[PDB]
From TrEMBL:
The keyword Hydrolase belongs to this UniProt entry's keyword annotation: yes
Domain Helicase C-terminal: 254-383
GO molecular function: ATP binding; helicase activity; hydrolase activity; RNA binding; U3 snoRNA binding
GO terms under biological process: brain development; maturation of SSU-rRNA from tricistronic rRNA transcript (SSU-rRNA, 5.8S rRNA, LSU-rRNA); positive regulation of male gonad development; ribosomal small subunit biogenesis; ribosome assembly; ribosome biogenesis
GO cellular component: cytoplasm; nuclear membrane; nucleolus; small-subunit processome
UniProt KW Signal keyword: no
Recorded superkingdom: Eukaryota
Protein name per UniProt: DEAH (Asp-Glu-Ala-His) box polypeptide 37
Stretches assigned to the Helicase ATP-binding domain: 28-195
Sorted UniProt keywords: ATP-binding, Helicase, Hydrolase, Nucleotide-binding
Amino acid sequence: VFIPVNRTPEMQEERLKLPILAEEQAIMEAVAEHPIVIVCGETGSGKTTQVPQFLYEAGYSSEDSIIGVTEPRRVAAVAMSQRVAKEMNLSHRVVSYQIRYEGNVTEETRIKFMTDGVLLKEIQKDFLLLKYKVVIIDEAHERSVYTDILLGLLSRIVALRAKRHLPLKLLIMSATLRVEDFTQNQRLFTTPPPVIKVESRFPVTVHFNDDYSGECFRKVCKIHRMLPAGGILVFLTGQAEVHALCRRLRKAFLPLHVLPLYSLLAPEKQAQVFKPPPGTRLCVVATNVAETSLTIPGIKYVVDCGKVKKRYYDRVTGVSSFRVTWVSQASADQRAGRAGRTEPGHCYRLYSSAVFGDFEQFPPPEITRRPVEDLILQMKALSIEKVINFPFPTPPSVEALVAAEELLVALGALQAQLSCPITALGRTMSTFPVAPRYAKMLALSQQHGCLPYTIAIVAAMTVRELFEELDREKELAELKGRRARVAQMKRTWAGQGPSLKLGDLMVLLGAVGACEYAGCSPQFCQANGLRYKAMLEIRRLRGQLTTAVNAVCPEDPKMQPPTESQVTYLRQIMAAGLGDHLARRVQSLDPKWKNAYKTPLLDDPVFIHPSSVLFKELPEFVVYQEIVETTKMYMKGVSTVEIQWIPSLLPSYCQFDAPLEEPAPSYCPESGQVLCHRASVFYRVGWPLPAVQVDFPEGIDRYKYFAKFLLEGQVFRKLASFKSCLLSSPSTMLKTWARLQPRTETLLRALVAHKADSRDSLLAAWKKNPKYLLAEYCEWLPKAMHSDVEKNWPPTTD
RNA sequence: UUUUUUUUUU
């Protein structure tokens, strides 16, 4: 049971400062008595660090059974692993972190810190989480997509483990007080788990009072002249406000060190905030990064916009947009908490006391605001067929769940309309750590040696804000030259000719290749307008994407430039990934459509993005990565599609009239199926598409054509020897002068009975009984031949 | 056709 730690005297006093220590036996008694415990403790409560220690003291860690702790951030995983390992007297062999592309875990590991996504991937490998006896899910109040999928899954895992008489304990740790979606949720936890509230210790003063930027300049002005020396933090909506206020404040200046903070800021400039100020007071203009991501020790006065920037996905169109709205009360309070963490602090809210009540208490969960295809593909891999049966803490919209299954079926991830389970292709995609669209690109890309190219493109698309912003006399020319420098570079990476057809996606590839060519130089990144932090993240992601692919397909990471054929094959892999994102140029009217494109998903005209390399080229068909609305509805991530590609690449999105007699249907040896040329038209828009070789539609005519090719020996080459001796032509399966011939019906009926319209279908039928078509096939040969046929009847080897 | 990303987990 009990396990020692050997506390050092100096860390003892610190540890005793935190409040949760008093309630240790209370939390440990709850954990023993209940299967699931919810621990609610504000920042500084020390719950995250100490609760794994308590359970370690109670002996939950063991050989097969360890304590796990899941976190939203990578940083919080590693940092927490280190702090606990030092707060206890234990090696990082015992207390470890696992994050995306780094590791710390050993058989010695008894407390494991991890990101929520890492736990999900373990749930894929073993759904029972046998290697865990306790799982702690921390920062549940953040309600990230992975916390939600984890909480719903673990309720089932806890149940499955319990009936196996191997109890798994789940502890849910929340900084905020409200857990209604957990306690009141009948589907998630049939019995409301006990809720433990831990108080913690530096009070925050809140002051209530068109453009939030102006008042903030005033507030920062008024505070600074008036109040004692202490850190100033201002929350602003976006980067340009941050820069507008910093330059404005620098112009304004007794002491003041002005530092702008935003997530994409260069890590060097970022770091300036934490270090204390050089007769100069600290005032930092920041986005939400200061609210959670960064903790600034010297801050004593915060000024609050009252406004957040968020990204909204339109379900009908699929389109994304960036809008500014009122903060949540919890976001408003948490921003205030930043003010007074190591001294009494001041929060001045630029909204009225009345406005604060108008705020939505809790921000909407991140799952409801975005496509959920990645999760459902994960859920389908765990055999969760009925998505609505899943116990979402907050369920996503119906249209969101229906859209996802439509996309995942369209990629081939989910089979077949009564149900759609994961496919073999869908199962291997589930392993890849990227969105299922790019996941299919990866699975599709295992050919022509462009796999590292596609891995690089996908990695460059998955990363956010690849290119440095560089926006908003002699100083303007320095900045303006940089833009022309980066634009010229973007064009240089994307060649002219077939290379330019890959467009923006080629520009990402050429950016990744050029960066790796210079050994990912920070000098190179600043020279060519690439972002250094993003480029490193690109490199790490390519590594993890390359290792994952090797698991699926047994077979030099930093690459060499592609040949023209490779670039066009890259175009086809990308178009197949982005099938739902196809636009056609308009030619015929309204002045709004002069250079526009039309996409079936939305009525409005869409345009190539002005910074895109395909902007002036304006090809007739493109696939876009995403559509973002600002002033117009713009296509970003654009690549060219050759119109004839569409039916062979995106057959699910097309509608074919009838199979064509000219050219006549053929048999495909690789597929094992009947092919035919079919004319097609895109589903909602009505775009005419040429006739191309496509699989023959399922139907009674398909069986006839397959039966013809089988008798000719094309389907199975063992039967090909007999083709000379057949009594009537194989052609009589389609049409015959001998109407009363029974030969053709008997073969066709037997084929229908076993749904044998393909090599794989018939080969399957021969497993269930290997003499399946023997009688019927013999009907087509003279009797003397029958015995030799039966002797080698399976016309398949193996 | 003319560029206006908040924040983060595999």
